[PDB]
Design goal:
- The PDB classes it as transferase.
- The entry lists the keywords N-glycosylation, Asn tautomeric form, AAD, Glycosyltransferase, GT-B, transferase.
- The assembly is dimeric.
- The complex is a heterodimer.
- Chain A is of the alpha/beta class.
- Chain A has helices at residues 9-17, 21-37, 57-77, 85-93, 95-103, 111-115, 135-143, 155-159, 163-174, 182-194, 196-199, 213-219, 230-244, 277-289, 305-308, 322-335, 350-355, 443-455, 474-485, 497-505, 520-527, 540-550, 563-575, 577-589, 592-596, 603-617, and strands spanning 258-259, 262-268, 294-299, 313-316, 340-343, 363-366, 381-385, 398-402, 429-437, 459-467, 489-492, 509-511, 532-535, 559-560.
- Classes of the chains: A alpha/beta, B little secondary structure.
- At the A-B interface, helix 12 of A face loops of B.
- The complex binds uridine-5'-diphosphate.
- Uridine-5'-diphosphate binds next to strand 10, helix 20 and helix 21 of chain A.
């Protein structure tokens, strides 16, 4: 007994047998949609399996991926199977999961299907696929052109054939939470250079896969290119165009309302609950802001009691519809005549990116929940701690550089308190922890760990505690890692917080990934009395590491400028057992964790009152 | 729960 019929692999297979293509696509989209809802878990997908796999999860998942891969092959190879444009649009949204069905199976990708679509026996390479001239075959091709594809595609040839298929595939290929393999990371690298100029040409999202737009926006921060955020400017323009075309008018600002003493600051949240990254970093500054401003929180039911409680009042957004949510936010700002709009995170919800492309308050502000520029006209100011900033040029907006201690962090609700420190005196093997999300893995980081293992005078074993490595994601991620580090690495799936600390607690040191580094991952490090190396760079998402290490009295040599620098320091920390133990005794004996939880939260509320006053001077 | 898309 359960809310709703599960998607069935058997239902899917029966449909392909009777050649009921529309039932078959429906069952397939039902299965991918459910996986997408569960971030890769296959609980509540229906399939029979050999009893030997009852108790072996990783092997069950591979069986599932192979059986789905076999079924999708029988379907998409049938030339009698015509795919509608609506079919294709729905598949482009969930290509990330198609990628995993094949990538987590033994088959790696869908290139064997694509080869059946080649009509030119006289072709130079097996990597060149020549298509019959018709829309049907081109959409089947683009849907099955996955991140791990080894088949040639030229974006200029694709663009000139159908802009909408080409645009959709570029969205689909930026959408995965893991894009770390050479094939996937290099498709995405190329897209980020080529696509922004093509995406500007679009007036609406109506013909693109819109429900992965926020993914396109967030995920570009994880490339290495200096100009990697450009796609966000392009996208900001299309969202703006789309929004106006839905009959959106900006708020005409004409009255600053006061509630109790103060003016009103409306706060729009994506994720906010006592164990979420965003509450740990940004809750303290929002509490203290409540002395200068009256605080209205807007959020979904996901936000817990402790999250609602940091606001004078709080309202649930009633549903998923974006136009209704921006209508509710205008009503709120029009009725309270709001002075400031604050989003501590922008980019994790599509609603919040729409909000950053419209006018609701004269002063509109973001923090760095997600540490990237927005390239938006409608955002005046970015809140950020002084020691976190690299170049001011990385940001299209004006920086409000608050003093080092302006955002005192907070422990997770799930944090332990009785933590036994372990300092292994001379370990035979130095266990090296990587606390990272699948987003932060890339060929550069894994080449680097490979080179570290090859030069280290001591045996090293890497332990990856992998956020977002769930269900059908994990086999693919595991093989990516093994392809660089063989038996010298272990890929731990996404685990509950207590279990994730047990994995790190087992380690002797840690390495922060790059280009995009850790924050909450560094609190996790010092929570266990661990030390580690990190890289620094111009972007905030490169510099936070440098900042937090300095806030701990840790030395400059733990912070690298270049990759080669990183490799020397990583080795140094792994070889010199006595030195690393020193650094760990420092962080422990000087309660380093307690110093990250401490500071003056008030400077956000004062600096934003200050800016309203200056604005009010000039009406 | 950490920093990723819905
Ligand atoms: O297996 C995992 C991996 C991650 N996390 C949580 O995710 C947080 C940080 O993830 P995020 O992507 O926000 O990293 P940050 O860049 O903020 O360090 C950790 O502190 C944990 O609370 C977890 O609970 N289990």
């Amino acid at each position: 007994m359960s809310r709703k019929k599960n998607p069935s692999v058997i239902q899917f297979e029966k449909a392909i047998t009777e050649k009921n293509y529309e039932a078959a696509c429906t069952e397939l989209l039902d299965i991918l949609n459910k996986i997408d809802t569960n971030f890769g878990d296959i609980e509540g997908i229906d399939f029979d399996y050999p009893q030997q796999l009852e108790t072996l999860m990783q092997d069950r998942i591979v069986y599932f991926c192979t059986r789905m891969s076999n079924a999708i092959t029988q379907l998409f190879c049938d030339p009698q199977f015509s795919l509608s444009e609506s079919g294709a649009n729905r598949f482009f949204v969930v290509q990330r999961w198609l990628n995993l069905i094949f990538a987590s199976s033994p088959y790696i990708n869908a290139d064997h299907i694509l080869q059946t679509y080649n009509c030119n026996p006289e072709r130079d390479s097996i990597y060149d696929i020549y298509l019959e001239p018709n829309k049907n075959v081109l959409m089947k091709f683009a849907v099955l052109y996955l991140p791990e594809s080894n088949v040639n595609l030229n974006l200029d040839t694709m663009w000139e054939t159908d802009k909408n298929i080409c645009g959709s595939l570029c969205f689909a290929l930026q959408s995965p939470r893991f894009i770390g393999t050479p094939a996937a990371f290099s498709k995405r690298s190329t897209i980020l250079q080529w696509f922004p100029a093509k995406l500007e040409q679009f007036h609406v999202l109506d013909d693109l896969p819109s429900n992965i737009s926020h993914d396109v926006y967030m995920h570009c921060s994880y490339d290495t290119a200096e100009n990697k955020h450009n796609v966000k400017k392009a996208l900001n323009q299309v969202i703006r165009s789309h929004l106006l075309k839905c009959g959106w008018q900006d708020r005409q600002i004409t009255q600053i309302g006061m509630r109790n003493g103060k003016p009103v600051m409306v706060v729009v949240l994506e994720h906010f609950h006592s164990s979420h990254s965003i509450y740990r970093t940004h809750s303290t500054s929002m509490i203290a802001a409540r002395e200068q401003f009256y605080l209205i929180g807007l959020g979904n039911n996901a936000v817990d009691q402790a999250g609602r409680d940091v606001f004078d009042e709080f309202h649930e957004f009633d549903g998923s519809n974006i136009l209704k949510k921006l209508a509710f936010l205008k009503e709120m700002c029009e009725k309270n005549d709001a002075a400031v709009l604050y989003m501590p995170s922008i980019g994790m919800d599509l609603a919040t990116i729409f909000v950053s492309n419209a006018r609701f308050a004269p002063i509109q502000v973001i923090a760095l929940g997600h540490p990237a520029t927005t390239h938006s006209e409608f955002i005046e100011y970015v809140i950020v701690e002084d020691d976190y900033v690299g170049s001011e040029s990385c940001f299209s907006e004006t920086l409000l550089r608050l003093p080092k201690d302006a955002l005192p962090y907070v422990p997770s609700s799930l944090a332990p308190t009785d933590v036994q420190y372990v300092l292994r005196e001379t370990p035979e093997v130095v266990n090296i922890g990587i606390a990272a999300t699948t987003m932060k893995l890339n060929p550069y980081f894994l080449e680097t760990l490979k080179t570290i293992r090859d030069r280290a005078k001591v045996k090293v074993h890497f332990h990856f505690a992998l956020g977002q490595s769930i269900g059908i994601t994990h086999p693919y991620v595991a093989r990516f890692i093994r392809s660089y580090l063989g038996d010298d690495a272990t890929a731990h799936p996404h685990s509950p917080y207590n279990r994730y600390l047990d994995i790190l607690h087992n380690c002797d040191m840690m390495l922060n990934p790059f280009p995009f580094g850790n924050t909450n991952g560094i609190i996790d490090m010092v929570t266990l009395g661990l030390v580690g190396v990190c890289k620094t760079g111009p972007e905030v998402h490169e510099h936070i590491d440098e900042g937090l290490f300095k806030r701990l009295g840790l030395p400059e040599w733990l912070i690298a400028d270049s990759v080669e620098d990183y490799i020397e320091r990583a080795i140094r920390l792994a070889e010199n057992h006595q030195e690393r133990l020193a650094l760990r005794r420092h962080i422990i004996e000087n309660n380093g964790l307690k110093t990250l939880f401490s500071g003056d939260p008030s400077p956000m509320g004062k600096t934003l009152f200050a800016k309203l006053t200056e604005w009010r001077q000039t009406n | 729960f950490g920093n990723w898309t819905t």
